[PDB]
């Protein structure tokens, strides 16, 4: 019931669109409403597209599993992944 929670969700995601992925995880790490409202596939799919060519290494244990079904799939009504951050957590340089 906070003021930031009471903000419209369109500008709320617009705010989070400017957040760096390194800083975004800690904001969603505060639990409550912010742990699930940061798990939006639409925002992270934009994150994946703008950060995939930047990286320079892929491993066997964290290979981009079915990535062609995630980023090159463009639009798909089967957006029930809900774990593009987990994909990003797998695709991050770590």
């Amino acid at each position: 019931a906070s003021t930031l929670t009471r903000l419209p969700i369109d500008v709320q995601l617009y705010i989070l669109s400017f957040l760096s992925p390194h800083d975004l995880c800690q904001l969603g790490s505060t639990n409550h409403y912010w742990n699930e409202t940061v798990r939006d596939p639409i925002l992270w799919r934009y994150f994946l597209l703008r950060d995939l060519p930047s990286w320079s290494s892929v491993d066997w244990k964290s290979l981009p599993d079915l990535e062609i079904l995630k980023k090159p799939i463009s639009e798909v009504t089967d957006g029930a992944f809900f774990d593009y951050m987990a994909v990003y957590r797998m695709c991050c340089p770590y």
Binding site: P8, D10, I42, E75, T77
Partner: protein, 736 residues
């Protein structure tokens, strides 16, 4: 944070106030925007419940509108449609503004999520217009607009705002549902529902109109009406249609209005060309040229007519053209100029049409009625050659320099179509020689310009002989100046000596018989020999006396007569001065002149009536002078003038000179083709005979076109000249 149940009644009242055009106030619009915003900012994204009501309301409203325009008359519904469409569009735009927030909070979210079948609110109104009102009423409204376009084509004007509104609506209903981000004017439904029907109606109507107009009007008025129809169709596309129809409608109208009747167009063309209607031919070409590659055969038709006209032109000249070159060249040049004027104005100087003109002009210049009368094509340039001689002979009339340059340019234009250019070269060289050795030329700058034009037309070696002729006559003038300076410095002579030194190779000339030089003339000839021995001992002279005139005093008569004549005539007069009674054999043994030319000069002397035969009652103009026939100088003859000219050509020697020139150009043709085949066969060494003659034709087509018996004779000459060997059995292939 207010649920949709409370918002929706007020929102629906406001939206219905928007759609029913009552000029809704600004406060109500901002209140509706506030309602939509407060609903959307109350699952993760809540716009589906609002979108469904907007989708269902638009479906409900249009169905209620469709009943009003269900089955009214065709002229009515279109107007109705336009009016409704206009209001709908405006209403939708205002509606869009409210759901402008729905255009960012939720519709963008659904498009990002990938759930298709969703649209922006303005695009939603357009799509539901494409599925509730445009689809059932589309056939009726497009039939109505085709009927109204037919009415406007028939002549009755009508309000074009209705048609422009219908076409604008048809353009705007084309939406890319899958990719709304893909902008640009999409014309899918405009082409699928209007362009096909409109094009088919235009095909049918112009088919009917063109068939009726051909069956009820002449061809030229049909050309006028067809040009008017094409311009009016470009106007119709420009004013109240779409831009993209411009190419397709123009192509379809050209295919149905001009192409499908193109055959009957040819049926008029020559007939039109028979009437010399230059403006009508211009209209004809302007309409035909809109069809690609349709002019071609038509183009050829023009060529044929010109050729026929050219032959008829020569038939207007008749037999007189064979001996009067001025009328013949003027007739040919007039036909060429008239058709050049017709092709440069009506036909817009088309390259293909100019090529057809040039081909036809060559075809009736190289072979026409006078060439058939002279049984040879070589008469065609020669007469033209004689014509330019008639424009360089120093006559009593003095032509102006500018118009002389213009008509020599026209002569060069005519000569450009001559095949046998070498015949013209030799004849012009001979006539230039006859002009220069008698210094009987016109203004010298005209001669230089004509030579320069010939050089520009046919390279350097074509007129290198004439250029060295001019430099030789200049050298001869300077040599005469040197001779007169030396003789003024040295002892004086007895006569004014004005020799013209000539080149033995360039100038076409033949040495006459021997001569008995007079002693007083020998006294100056020996002085000239000493002169050229002092100046240049490396040159030799022949001194032909066929072309050498001069005036002699006439003391043994009534008074001093300064009449001039030929060197043979001066020799005869001096021989009679020694003794006034000479026989033909006596003149032959004295002057050492062969029989034929001596007989010719004696008969032209008797024609001049300067002296009489031994018998006055005997024939003069029809007598064959035997060697024993005596002639006595008629001392009783009186001359009307002190200076009398006798040097006039004889018809017999005129024809002899013409046939000698024909033989000379024949042997030059033989030598040129011999040297050409020698130069060609060394390049290939394997080329066969027909290919060899084809290559020869290609390389010397700029000079002449030899006859194939001459080609065979040259082939035989080069075979028994042993320059190259023939292949036994297969006579086609040769080798060196």
């Amino acid at each position: 944070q207010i649920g949709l149940d409370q918002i929706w009644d007020d929102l629906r009242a406001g939206i219905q106030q928007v759609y029913t055009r009552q000029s809704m106030a600004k406060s109500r619009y901002m209140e509706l925007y506030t309602h939509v915003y407060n609903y959307c900012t109350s699952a993760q994204f809540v716009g589906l419940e609002l979108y469904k009501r907007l989708k269902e309301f638009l479906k409900n409203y249009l169905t209620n509108l469709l009943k009003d325009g269900e089955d009214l008359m065709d002229e009515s519904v279109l107007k109705f449609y336009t009016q409704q469409w206009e209001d709908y569009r405006f209403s939708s735009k205002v509606l869009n503004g409210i759901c402008a927030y729905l255009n960012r909070h939720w519709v963008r979210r659904e498009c990002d999520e990938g759930r298709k079948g969703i649209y922006e609110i303005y695009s939603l109104a357009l799509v539901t217009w494409r599925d509730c009102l445009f689809r059932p009423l589309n056939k009726q409204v497009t039939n109505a607009v085709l009927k109204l376009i037919e009415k406007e084509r028939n002549g009755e004007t009508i309000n074009t705002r209705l048609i422009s509104g219908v076409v604008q609506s048809y353009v705007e209903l084309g939406l890319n549902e899958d990719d709304a981000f893909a902008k640009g004017p999409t014309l899918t439904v405009y082409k699928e529902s209007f362009e096909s029907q409109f094009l088919a109606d235009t095909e049918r109507f112009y088919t009917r109109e063109s068939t009726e107009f051909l069956q009820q009007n002449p061809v030229t008025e049909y050309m006028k009406k067809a040009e008017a129809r094409l311009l009016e169709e470009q106007r119709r596309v420009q004013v109240y249609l779409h831009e993209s129809t411009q190419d397709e409608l123009a192509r379809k109208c050209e295919q149905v209005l001009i192409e499908k009747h193109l055959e009957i167009f040819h049926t008029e063309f020559q007939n039109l060309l028979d009437a010399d209607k230059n403006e009508d031919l211009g209209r004809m070409y302007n309409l035909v040229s809109r069809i690609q590659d349709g002019l071609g055969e038509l183009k050829k038709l023009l060529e044929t007519h010109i050729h026929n006209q050219g032959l008829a032109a020569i038939e207007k000249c008749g037999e007189a053209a064979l001996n009067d070159p001025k009328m013949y060249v003027q007739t040919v040049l007039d036909v060429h100029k008239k058709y050049n004027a017709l092709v440069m104005s009506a036909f817009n100087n088309d390259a293909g049409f100019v090529a057809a003109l040039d081909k036809a002009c060559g075809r009736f210049i190289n072979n026409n009625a006078v060439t058939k009368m002279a049984q040879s094509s070589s008469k065609s340039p020669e007469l033209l050659a004689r014509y330019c001689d008639s424009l360089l002979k120093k006559s009593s009339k003095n032509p102006e320099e500018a118009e002389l340059e213009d008509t020599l340019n026209q002569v060069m234009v005519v000569f450009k179509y001559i095949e046998d250019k070498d015949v013209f070269q030799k004849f012009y060289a001979k006539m230039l020689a006859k002009r220069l050795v008698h210094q009987n030329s016109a203004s010298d700058d005209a001669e230089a310009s004509m030579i320069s034009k010939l050089k520009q037309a046919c390279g350097f070696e074509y007129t290198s002989k004439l250029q060295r002729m001019f430099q030789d006559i200049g050298v001869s003038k300077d040599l005469n100046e040197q001779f007169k300076k030396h003789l003024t410095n040295s002892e004086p002579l007895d006569l004014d000596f004005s020799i013209q030194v000539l080149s033995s190779g360039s100038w076409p000339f033949q040495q006459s018989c021997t001569f008995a030089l007079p002693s007083e003339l020998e006294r100056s000839y020996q002085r000239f020999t000493a002169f050229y021995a002092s100046r240049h001992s490396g040159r030799k002279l022949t001194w032909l006396y066929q072309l050498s005139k001069g005036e002699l005093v006439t003391n043994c008569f009534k008074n001093r007569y300064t009449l001039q004549a030929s060197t043979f005539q001066m020799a005869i007069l001096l021989q009679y001065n020694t003794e006034d009674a000479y026989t033909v054999q006596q003149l032959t043994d004295s002057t050492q002149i062969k029989m034929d030319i001596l007989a010719q000069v004696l008969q032209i002397l008797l024609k001049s009536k300067l002296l009489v035969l031994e018998d006055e009652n005997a024939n003069v103009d029809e007598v064959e002078l035997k060697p024993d026939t005596l002639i006595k100088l008629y001392l009783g003859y009186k001359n009307k003038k002190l200076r009398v000219n006798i040097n006039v050509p004889m018809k017999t020697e005129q024809k002899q000179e013409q046939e000698t020139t024909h033989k000379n150009i024949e042997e030059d043709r033989k030598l040129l083709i011999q040297a050409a085949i020698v130069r060609i066969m060394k390049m290939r060494k394997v080329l066969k005979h027909q290919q060899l003659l084809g290559e020869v034709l290609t390389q010397l087509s700029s000079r002449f076109k030899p006859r194939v018996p001459v080609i065979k004779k040259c082939i035989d000459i080069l075979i028994e000249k042993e320059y190259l060997e023939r292949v036994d059995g297969e006579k086609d292939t040769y080798s060196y």
